[PDB]
Amino acid sequence: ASATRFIQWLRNWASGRDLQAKLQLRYQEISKRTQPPPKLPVGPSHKLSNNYYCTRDGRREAMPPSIVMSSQKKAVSPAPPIKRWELSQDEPYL
Template structure:
């Protein structure tokens, strides 16, 4: 006994349909014979801070509480908040960024 495709038309109509489509028609219906097996292995994920049973408070793992104000690395006065890695510090003047094009004084 030949296996019949579920919900398909006869061979003459299949050839006509494939000719009019310009390609071979594929059925998008989900039948048991055409579905792949759902036997994927379970994910192997490392334990995080939420996997602990005790001392697992929400405030200690809330990412919004980790946000702090930005650290000033350099200011307009020329003083640097970070060092260059050597014991002597060099005074570097901070230049003002140039304005592109010619400015029009409208006052």
């Protein structure tokens, strides 16, 4: 930020860019190092009623694997064939 005008011009010309608009050294646009305290929200299970744990218990819904075949009609694939990707409309070629 403290460079003289001629030096700013010289390095702007050498790099071909306007380097003063996006300096890599941080000045005063960064946040203050002291902030007001937060007040964080609570989660969906913070309730006084209609909140029995047995209705929101993910672990107790896990089940042992389904046995499809054990040693005790059209062909299928594991899933449908993957759809072909489309070219980017933002910038297809770099």
